[model samples]
Target chain A: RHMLTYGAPFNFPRWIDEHAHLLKPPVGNRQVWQDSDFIVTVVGGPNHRTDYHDDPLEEFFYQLRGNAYLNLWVDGRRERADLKEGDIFLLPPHVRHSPQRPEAGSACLVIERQRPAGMLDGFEWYCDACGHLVHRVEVQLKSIVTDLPPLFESFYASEDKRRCPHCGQVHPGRAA
Target chain B: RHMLTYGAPFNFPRWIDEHAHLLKPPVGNRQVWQDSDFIVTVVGGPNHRTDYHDDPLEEFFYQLRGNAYLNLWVDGRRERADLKEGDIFLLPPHVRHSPQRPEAGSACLVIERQRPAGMLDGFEWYCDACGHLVHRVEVQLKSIVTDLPPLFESFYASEDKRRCPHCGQVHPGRAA
Candidate 1:
């Protein structure tokens, strides 16, 4: 059974790779490998937040142990959903999404489909609040598609605070 | 800690569909699914005896929970090995193998990759001792592939009883 709750802790505009361990323990502790065509991650956290980012692959989130507040933005529309155990959701290519929890934290199984079935390969994220463009963190492209550019890492922190001209919203760096 | 004990009950050669619940209950009741590019299974059974049958696909078994004996035959050579936790083993296609647990049952993670990936794919199983052919067991092809024909249940049972007219030795079926 799922009960919708409001006023959950939400964080945005912070990159995950830096503070991923703070959100959950190292996956190596489970003695599992991350080389599967469909990678499965069991994420555990007390209170966690993430920024709008695109993944280079299709992903499915299946909640197995706790609850979460998923704020999703697609095609400029925003929707919020309360997820509990047994809740399954899919994020297609370039879909901007994040999750939050107020009561405690949550654990979820994140499955990714690799191989020829790449999804978010050419995706680019422009901060709706800030004009700064969100770049891929650390992904390697195996195929040579002309439209696909190599992943870039920007070091300008001041640029991360600029406001988006189109949306007139202040840009927040990767989720905290 | 590792302890060597005989009369352990380890039984392999049982057919299980992907997404089907394991026959024996595990400590965590881990459920497996054929939901990826490959099918996944985790077996945890007590002492038991199972028949030896020919595997049609490439199969990889990783011992994650306990110890057991693997009875395998390849090219007229029969061998048995005691496997403990964290051990990995591979079985080539069309090989005769089975699990034998005489003391306590063991838990193993089985991964099989199918070419097209379907429920009704893979080799049939034939019991050499019982002369029974079980069709369409749906094993993982990625687990075994050594220049062998797709295993067929009827072919295995027939080949088991077939005697070479020239050498008087039983001839395994030719690779398909």
Candidate 2:
């Protein structure tokens, strides 16, 4: 029988570069391949960040090398999980989440279920200060549903930019 | 919220030694992990030349590094395919097959559905030249299955010690 190579057909680098904007920047270089409902990624980076965003599909992150901190908001609670090499974690849909590369950098292999096939519709970023909304792509940001003071608004909003302490320069903000 | 970390929970070297019989000789090392129905393995080497064997599970092999020659047989039809780094192949149940290593050797990542697990129930080998069958626990054997050229009735059913050209020493042999 003739063999079929699934996931990536060919020339993955070129494909990823062409779709770079569709990917989150602070997450570093990422190559995505999909087959049926499965999506696999080969990710590279040391220090990567993303704004608060939620996916409508289930996802998994497998660490092939190094370490990472997974920050998640699930069930009205905020949690952080540290993962080392050979670790795997599952993320359900609509669970606010982001990954952090603390200390040394790391590389990870990620797999997820892609509903409605190719292309992510969009993402939403909640204000971390005023509970304001910042929408992107297919995601819509909503007001925080807590009784906390307005000072907590920034808690829901995505960080606008990262400030470098040494250089006193403001790097572009991430959507984590 | 409590966090779950599925760290490196596998004892690879020990698992290999315990299940050595289920594996072909000139042994190769592979890294495997499982979560629910999903499994992933990092396999090293691609030595071929062993008789056809069957594993009772469905799995896919992805070449992470190096190249290999996949020698496959299905429904009495034989075929060969070359797998380079980043190539993927699937091996369904009852598929008779083996992989020939490139001159420079190869490394592959294998993923499979894990259930009804354990090594003993997975693979069964048959020798075409002789009808002798060795169970998984039989450690020392001249041949697990003798080529089927000799008549079954003509062979005496007994066990003996014989020197093997490959091992350069006398080992247990099934008498004919």
Candidate 3:
């Protein structure tokens, strides 16, 4: 009798020649493997995200292929880092950041820890000029695949949600 | 006040040029933070494994540099996959395998699941020619840093453990 106690093991045998494709979520892309320690997902889609993520869970992004940029608010200052092929970036927990845009041809490996039980993650926005808190959402995240998109959609779809109260600036959704 | 409730995220930035080094154990090696899920360890060493391993947890090995050979038994047949630099090879759960001589300048990232509570892993051996099991050790595995070496020691240290019960041939320790 064949005894199979656990799942099969895999390492992306060839990253340069045969890298992972975007997921179809819970099942879309080729997940490296979501162990109890970390979850690795490869996505290459375009995003027009504006809300700055202020989650407690740490995230790591590596460009397995193509070009991308990570825009962040570090110590109250906005900075941008270009993620070239094979570039790795580390973001500390609670770092205010936004995934501004990813080129359609970009494929990145996203690594993150499963937020510990009883912990919640957040999404926040600020006035570009005055630095006033524009909007915020606290979430008991269920899954990054299904939970994150709607929060972005809520802010992006609403002109009021994107408006900065302090600066009276109409937060242009990817247009500003 | 910086609220650092969880760990930050990081990407290695560069893997091919500057990679992981040898670990000095229960406390060695800069593990990529293992929680309830996975542990990724990069070990730079030369291994001449004389005994066979039949672990319950599937194993994935990616060669960071130099040469390592994974000799395995799949569906009752013996096969070996040479791990070249940047090569990845995954083994099925409970597969009988052995880490044959790794070149002195070798480095590999070995990934495996934490054997869940109450579960046990195993070590086993068979005559390479006559196909008769020469030795077996069922173990309650603790950590790869400590649990695996002694299992190999049990078989390699004994002359009787290497003797074939089926064929008259004397099993050699990494002599092949």
Candidate 4:
């Protein structure tokens, strides 16, 4: 009778759609649950244009509804992949990628391994017009649950990440 | 370029329903995917039976369709749990429990941690009458994805586990 009381199967789209409004900022996603080794979450935005984030570990995204894009910049070039309903995308470790729902309202499940203690998380942005890499921050990802909002506080509402180094144009960022 | 291509998304119920026919014997589950520490699988049996198992780690089951029962024995008494659509059941570690779907065409997703080397897995059964514990086996669980069928090779075909130790009545087992 040494049974553990961890919760059971999480109903998809249905429960997620009902409670998605509660998945606010800082983590950049709403967590479904987490066990010993993995973090289950969903990243959805009715509207967004945030910059790219690069993790030291891999992350998998499964599109639940509508359209989304996984934007990436690696090897001196930038490319993005389209993800629709039933599509899956695996972002490599240490590579910058921005996940975009690009819809008025849509959701996608993101699965990844947990971040170890004292790990460095890299968040960066690139120039939209000229594709020039802009700003970057190597910060400790204390918790995806509560640390993402402050990250966008200065970036989204300020002229830091948006100011393209190549064009010297004042491009600004926005947050939720 | 150190990318591991294990695909991006596993289309649930949709793709699960499409290829469920392939989940026959041996594993009795289609592995969605796996990492170093976890395995995700959906187990559906066109046919099955009630057999109690003791695992070294906890397991989470969420019922997707049909009615099912998780029969348990604790504190020298036995009880059963009912799981319906959207219902979840977390079976504790090393507990004696038998899961049954009384009807055909039932499916559920099971989540669990990986069994490491030298870990033991126990499979057992009891009498339907008089609450008498029946057969038992304490063996190594090499792989849930590939090692369960041989465990039941002679149990389902034989009436050994069904025969009550206390009541001496023959309890039948089903499989597919």
Candidate 5:
């Protein structure tokens, strides 16, 4: 019943070094701290995300190692911002963003507020050929590790869900 | 009135380089983000804090540059922890700590919760010679920039306030 408790300090560089081997495959993240107010994690890279995320709350990112790009969907167009080492960023609420950490060496500290009851977080896929919405899914995320894989599975399992209604083009699924 | 509005991102290294000149003498901190739930700041060092802080909520610390020692008041004695570069730490609530960043090159990111109504934040000065409490002050901190200087002024102005009653040793004031 106690969601809040005190813990020891974290050394980000040391943590990244120790956990780099574990940060592989389908999801490249480890939850460092999760409380009622804040959910903090260290996310690794080489993530070629095909979906854009729309969170109900703002997100904070601090680039711990290497470099990355935060691809934001603004005004119905995609914009890219550079997040180098030691860089900090705050993404506004409901702003669709695709965080591109496209290297194995890249890592970032991501902090987000715990979702309130009944507030849904969304993920969207757009057709690369026509830039039209292909698929969208919303869920109340309880565990990033457990809650995310099923969504990925559900979207990739159906061919019709990956097809854009506007352009008759199908989005590519993640590589094995 | 609307403290919850959206804002842009921040780059930590770029911010420190831009504001390093301003982070000298008196206080060595600049408030980066302050909301109803979180208060974030970038604090520069060379700060030799004579006073220990006892906070009602837990505090988060990320060592951005150089290294420092976090001195804690535990079981009527002092304990020290090293905060090297890229280290992140969470201090438990109501634990008295004195953060020592004794180099101008050192910097840290300090995160805390916004003080609730009627919850007092405290500072205590102990005698260096005898380790006895010299002075203590508590206040409802609204603005760290504005609220802190008067307390420093109040403590330093009176010789009695700086003097330890148990040991008759006087605490040193900040240099102008």
Candidate 6:
């Protein structure tokens, strides 16, 4: 009885490949463990995201396959953290980071605490050349699958938003 | 400040080899994240244990390196689950399981919830020859590193306890 309902294992590579069609750009994550204390998902890669994520809860990451880089904004400048396969990282709250997974077959198991009632998650954009904060929006983050794509679209739709004011450098977007 | 204090990654292979000496026989799991809502650890293998773990909380497992088998007792019969590298599994509570990781490079990241008050964790043994219940010990597991070793010793030291009454078969123990 208990064994039948439970004890089913999720293979990372298999899950990613099975749900490859759903892995759209700008943060595509499929939840592995639902209705639990933790928000567990396997994030598929080649997302090509340029915005930084700011969270109120710690995010735990395990690189399931391939290599990636986490771009962090620190002390008014940008820094980088390499996440090779088999690397597990616990990203503390409020540090803005943009994860770069440049190829297919890149996936990661990300675990984060369920956001409390008052917690807020921020998605911010920065100038690629001058490192100046371009735009930021904070939301309650009810659903990542539904809530995230529109924000990315809203920012990218505007030419002014993509162009850096200081350096006059337009941030690159996915080619037409 | 936040970037320096947080956002550091833990490499699984690096952590395992650094703490290789601590990976003793039976169930050698070193705590990677302490004082959190989850009990997170990297369990080193070649444990060669005959006992099944009965937990009150769900256990989350991610195979870091090498393949292993989870021997489960279900409906009075033993079943096996194969866990290759990069597989993630959520093992439900009370489904008795004995994990077999026969190689030194085998390590898995196990995450379980902090036990609530009055909850008990069990270490159970069954007869290998006839699949009969042998000896079982239930404890309010205060510490896996400290509380577990004594239970193995107590059961191993007594031949009467190790011997299954129904089958007259003695469960195997680690060699001296």
Best model per TM-score: 5
For A86-132, candidate 4 gives per-residue lDDT tens digits of 67555667767777666644677676665778777888877768877
Best of the candidates, DockQ:
6
lDDT of 6 by residue, A112-134 (tens): 76677879899988876777777
Where is the poorest 10-residue window by lDDT in model 4 chain A?
A1-10
Q: Give candidates' CA RMSD values in order.
A: 14.8, 12.8, 6.4, 5.1, 4.6, 5.3
Model 6 lDDT on a 0 to 1 scale = 0.77
**Candidate 1 local lDDT, B20-112, one digit each (tens):** 244353231232433343445556665343335454445555564567666655445556755566465555545565665442345666655
Worst 10 residues of 6 chain A by lDDT: A1-10
The CAPRI-style docking tier of model 3 reads incorrect
| Model 2 C-alpha lDDT per residue in residues B150-174, reported as the tens digit of each score | 2221222222212233333332332
Kindly list the per-residue Cα lDDT of model 5 for residues A1-176, writing each as its tens digit: 11115455667778888888766555688877665356778888778777788888777788878788877777668678778887887666787887888878678888776687899999988888888888999999887888888898888888989988998987886641
lDDT of 4 at A152: 66
lDDT values of the candidates? 0.44, 0.46, 0.62, 0.66, 0.77, 0.77
- lDDT (tens digit, per residue) of candidate 6 on B1-176: 56635436767778889887666464466887655555678887777677899988777788867778789987778898887887878777788988888777678888776677799999988887877788889999877888988898899889989888998887666541
Provide the lDDT at B142 for model 5.
86
Off by over 4 Å in 2: A1-38, A42-69, A72-97, A100-108, A112-176, B8-27, B32-36, B49-58, B74-76, B86-96, B102-105, B116-176
Two-way TM-score contest, 1 vs 6, winner: 6
TM-score of chain A of 2: 0.56
Q: Name the TM-score of chain A in model 6.
A: 0.82
lDDT score, candidate 4, position B62: 65
CA lDDT, candidate 1, residue B157: 64
lDDT of 3 by residue, A1-176 (tens): 23222233333435523543443222334455544344556766455456778767566666766676766776567777666766655556787777643565566766666676778888887887887888898888767767877887788788998888888886766544
- Against the true structure, what is model 1's DockQ? 0.03
Docking class of predicted structure 1: incorrect
User: Per-residue alpha-carbon lDDT of model 5 for B6-85, expressed as tens digits?
Assistant: 35555678888888865655668888765535677888877876667878777778888888887877656777878888
TM-score of chain B of 1: 0.48
